[PDB]
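Example 3.
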Amino acid sequence: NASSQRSGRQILSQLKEATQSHQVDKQGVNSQKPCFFNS
Amino acid sequence: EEVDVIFDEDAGFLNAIKTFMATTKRPVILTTSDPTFSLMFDGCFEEIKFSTPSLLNVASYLQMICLTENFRTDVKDFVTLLTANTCDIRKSILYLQFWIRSGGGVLEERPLTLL
Amino acid sequence: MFEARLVQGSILKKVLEALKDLINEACWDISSSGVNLQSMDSSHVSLVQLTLRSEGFDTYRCDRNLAMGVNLTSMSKILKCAGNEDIITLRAEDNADTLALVFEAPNQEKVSDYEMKLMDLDVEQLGIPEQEYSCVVKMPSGEFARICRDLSHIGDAVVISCAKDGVKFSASGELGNGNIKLSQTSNVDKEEEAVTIEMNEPVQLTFALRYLNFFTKATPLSSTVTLSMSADVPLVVEYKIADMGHLKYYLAPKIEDEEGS
Amino acid sequence: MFEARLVQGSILKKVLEALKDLINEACWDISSSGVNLQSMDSSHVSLVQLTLRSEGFDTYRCDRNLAMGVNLTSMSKILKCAGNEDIITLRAEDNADTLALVFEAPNQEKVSDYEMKLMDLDVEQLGIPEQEYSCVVKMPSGEFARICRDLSHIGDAVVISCAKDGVKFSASGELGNGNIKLSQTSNVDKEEEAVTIEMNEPVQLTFALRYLNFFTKATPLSSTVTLSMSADVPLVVEYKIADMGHLKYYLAPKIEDEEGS
Amino acid sequence: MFEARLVQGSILKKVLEALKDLINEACWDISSSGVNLQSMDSSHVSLVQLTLRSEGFDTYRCDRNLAMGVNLTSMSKILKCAGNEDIITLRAEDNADTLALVFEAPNQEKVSDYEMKLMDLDVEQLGIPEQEYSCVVKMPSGEFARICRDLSHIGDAVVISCAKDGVKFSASGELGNGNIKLSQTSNVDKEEEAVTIEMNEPVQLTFALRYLNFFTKATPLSSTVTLSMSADVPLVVEYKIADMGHLKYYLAPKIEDEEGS
Amino acid sequence: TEDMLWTEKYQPQTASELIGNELAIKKLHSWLKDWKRRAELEERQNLKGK
Amino acid sequence: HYELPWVEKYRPVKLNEIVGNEDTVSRLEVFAREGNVPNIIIAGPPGTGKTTSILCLARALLGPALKDAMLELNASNDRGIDVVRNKIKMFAQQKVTLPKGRHKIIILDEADSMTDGAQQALRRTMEIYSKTTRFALACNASDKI
Ligand SMILES: Nc1ncnc2c1ncn2[C@@H]1O[C@H](COP(=O)(O)OP(=O)(O)OP(O)(O)=S)[C@@H](O)[C@H]1O
Ligand SMILES: [Mg+2]
């Protein structure tokens, strides 16, 4: 979101492995939506 | 959400997302409200357009919502409310929530078969 | 009502510098057994599970189970004034918005009290069940950091390939290819650099390099490391905290775009 | 006709970086007693005072009293290119509009000279009497710098309190509250200072973070600093420079309001 | 099919540290007689030369010559995980684009199997005069590094004069002319350490501090180094390991600009 | 006794529960079905490889 | 002893004491009585009672927790991008124990001095934390929002 900090280096360093890897918790509590931010 | 909103703090964001789409293996969804973002942004992407919904359908939907909360209300009032909001669903839903939980506007009986 | 008297705060320093940028908030799940932390990172592809046993603290008191989500930037700030040798007091009420950190400086009386609010996380504890790992490895601390930094100097994706001798780490980058094999160095003076392997089957996975760098940033707190890795499971990097507890690292492997024949 | 010989230019560089952001301009008045500066903030909430005795300079010469005003930014631009070990000359004429800074050679091969125009301004002698303060402490400067920069990122304002127990710092920020307690038995080991009180009554006031951080920009002048504090007469920060003079600081507290019922 | 076997890691780990930022490309001429390195600076001022012999290596094998080319930084990153006591082995194929690097185990059973991509450029031939020099001196290496590091604080160009009184290194710059002159007599804990001169005519030139500081990074190879200086040719520094080969680095003089008369 | 807005009370759990823009939601749902099928096929490839 | 201005000496403390716009007054009264108020944008002429109605609504809904579950921004505060980045999100995430149906409350006094990008940032924050946090705003010209 625009409400959180979204700068290029930060978003790349904290969101690239979301699409370059598997998910560590593939079972259980999965349908929650963490708002991505860096305070 | 709102790729169109770019600040000076948001430095190199369009280049960043270009790199994301370039190197992704998972689905990426961009949403925005402006039509101009389609022309200034360069890349390969599938486009999906949401038109303004039909007034009578969302009027019936809001009327079911107020019916579930034990309120009966005419269609034309909701049509006026939606056209005042330019058929905005969240605006009409939120103002309906306010106006319902306040206890309703005017108590007038209207016998309609089509209590 | 919760009270902890951490006999030493430098271990908290080391674990937080291990997790100062990977995970975003820290969760404390607290019962009679001890203090538990189940935090999944900003990419939500790696998990950190930290367990402190109740006997490790000077005093431990927990009237009921408590879950506190705390901002990590806040604790990263407050603890940079915490001494290398000191006593720390964790203070938490039953149903409050508060968490107090009491620092007794090495002066006769220099008490620093930092009170932080709670960030109200709706995500509970998360952790995999216990499963037999076909690849369990006793490996050293510092040289792991050296070879991760060398792979970082080479590439950005890590090939982990265990075999009968040990494991091979490969990294094919644009600068070049670097492949280092570790095997049975058990017959050595100290057991911390001893490598003994009790693996079952050779299996290969690939992982994010930078994550392995942050997880090996926690090298000097433990003398050795155990690794638990197998097929279709996260890589597990675990450290034993001598007389305090144990920490667990879970790594989802990199997704591979396998091509049909 | 005015000649001053600053023994070491490090002190002048230090006081300039101590007051670089505080004030619009520096207006010095010179007498046979010495040099004085009582300049009060552009936002009109604080005053810097500096008195340097004539004997502190290598050679101090005056013919009459003179008050001259100098823009701070160009003064900083000139002094930032001066060696700290250097011996400096400040020359002022009787009626000219230009002040001369004759720096000796920092490299022992190039004597530097710079000039500054005079800026006329209404400056009043804020002759406050030095009343007896109900709270007087001595406490090291570097610690006071580290604690203000500790509480600054916590709070936009600090509650100072002075009691018989000791001196106490609170800061209720949005992330949470930060508290620091000192004691009179609390003697530090960084610079070997025993914190003391000469207080009479407990007092609690509130001061902004920004000004206090830029008061701690005067840390390297003296090892210890004297804080004088009263229920009505505001905060006094006093550095006693060795054989040079004394550096007093007046900061008024923020008003406090009682919350309505 | 080329394979070289160096007996200890102390050789490469410091000769490459001498070339940390000197030449962008490690250019080898691999012959059956031995290994040569002929790499030339991008500033057209510094030439570097190595001649490793077959007798120094454990066993030398060559089927054909190589115009071998290695990138510097990645080779440094590969080098930084080499054991000091380990045996270095390197393989270059006939047509493949990989340079294999297998070292002995730093953990006594943990061996390396590295690769290195081959880069192909002009690999132009560099001519060496193999001439006579007006002044040759046998000189301690660590003391030369000490003098170079002491004079590097002052300026950028050092004047060097070699005569029968010895060498004179003067940094005529800003801070001061640091004059260091060493005679024939030099007394250490060893029985002999002579700064001896075998000269014909006294020579006087000017060299750069940065390249001299880079040259002094090859200190641990040889305790005694031969420095060659003539009137017109560049400075030649030759570290003779007496079993591996000779490190010959050539630095062009700084020509003094003749002002008009 | 409620503590939460009608927008999230009557928030559509299913894409079929959305009102209007039927073609757009069918295209989006088909695209996400194709992508989850691709992810499932990649998972099947991973288990087939090992 | 101090001459308190009558504008604040006689500002109402209970919602029924406010006159004008009586239908919205009754709606604010029933929302103070029961709770679970939605996000409110009061718009009107200056000096009408908007800030009074908002503050009295907050006081009636909270009570003793008015010093903690309530937070206020006016044009005297910063109200730039960085504060709507950090502070308001930190509070909207901040845990506060409250009675049932009672939510943490943020007041933006005279939101017409919000910059456009500040509102663009504020949208996601106000819409995702709606389970525990409600927003109230005041303005004179609605088009400035
Ligand atoms: N309807 C009212 N009933 C009672 N007192 C009122 C009323 N309107 C204003 N006042 C008084 O006048 C003051 C101003 O009220 P405000 O709510 O601040 O005005 P406003 O309608 O919010 O418009 P502003 O402040 O110019 S943005 C209050 O503190 C009361 O003392
Ligand atoms: Mg108002």
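The interface with chain D takes residues 71, 74, 77-78, 81, 99, 105-117 of chain C (CB under 8 Å). Helices of chain C lie at 10-18, 72-78, 142-154, 209-216.
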